[PDB]
Structures are given as C-alpha cells and as structure tokens.
Amino acid sequence: AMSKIEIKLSDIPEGKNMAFKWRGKPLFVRHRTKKEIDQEAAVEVSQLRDPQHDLERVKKPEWVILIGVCTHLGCVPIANAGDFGGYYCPCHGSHYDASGRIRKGPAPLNLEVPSYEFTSDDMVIVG
Numbered sequence: 001a002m003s004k005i006e007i008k009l010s011d012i013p014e015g016k017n018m019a020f021k022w023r024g025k026p027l028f029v030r031h032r033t034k035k036e037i038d039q040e041a042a043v044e045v046s047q048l049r050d051p052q053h054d055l056e057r058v059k060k061p062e063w064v065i066l067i068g069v070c071t072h073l074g075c076v077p078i079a080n081a082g083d084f085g086g087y088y089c090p091c092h093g094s095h096y097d098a099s100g101r102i103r104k105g106p107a108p109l110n111l112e113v114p115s116y117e118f119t120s121d122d123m124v125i126v127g
C-alpha cells in the first residue's frame with residue numbers, strides 16, 4: 001500500500017510541520033495553533049493571486065495538509081520561513097502562508113491540497 005498513506009496525528013505536536021514521502025514527493029502534515037488558524041481566517045481573500053478561504057483548504061482547522069512542491073518550478077517549500085509564518089521556497093523566493101496560499105514571489109498557485117479524510121481523532125488517511 002503506497003497509493004494511500006495513513007498518518008498518526010498525536011505524533012505531530014502543535015506548531016510542528018511533519019514531512020512524509022507520498023507518491024514520490026514530500027507530503028506535509030502540520031498541526032496549527034489557534035493563533036495560526038485565526039490569522040489565516042483574517043486574510044482578505046480578494047487580494048489573493050489564487051483566492052480561497054482557509055476553511056475550503058482544510059477539513060479540521062488545527063490541521064493543514066499539503067503537497068510539499070512549489071507551484072512555481074517544483075522546489076520544496078521550507079516550513080516556518082518567509083514573511084507569513086507559512087513556508088518559503090528558496091529557489092525563486094515564493095512566500096506561502098500557514099494555509100499554503102501563495103502570498104509573495106513568482107509562484108502562480110496555492111500549494112496543492114490532496115484528497116484526505118480523518119478516520120478517527122488520531123488518524124488521517126491521504127490519497
């Protein structure tokens with residue numbers, strides 16, 4: 001079983017972005033704090049290059065799950081870097097927020113949100 005990955009949530013503490021390998025690429029499972037959740041909720045969406053509310057990019061507010069591949073040219077976004085406390089792609093300087101939305105730099109789109117579901121309070125199944 002490699003098409004779907006099952007991740008134990010209790011292993012990822014608040015504030016941590018945990019990376020896994022899925023379908024040959026990085027997969028990020030990040031436990032967000034109340035502060036991060038509220039900050040993403042405060043974003044004025046009409047000004048975004050790729051407009052989406054934070055709540056249509058996550059199922060549970062305290063968890064953001066993203067494909068760790070920069071939408072510009074494919075490099076790997078670095079967690080807790082950049083001007084928006086989200087991610088930073090060093091290849092050409094794209095800055096993403098904690099929702100994975102593109103906020104500064106050349107990338108054209110928000111980081112991809114894969115298909116996933118929570119099977120219980122402790123597990124999330126991606127794919």
Ligand code: FES
Binds near residue numbers: 070073
């Ligand atoms: S590949 Fe990420 S900014 Fe260019």
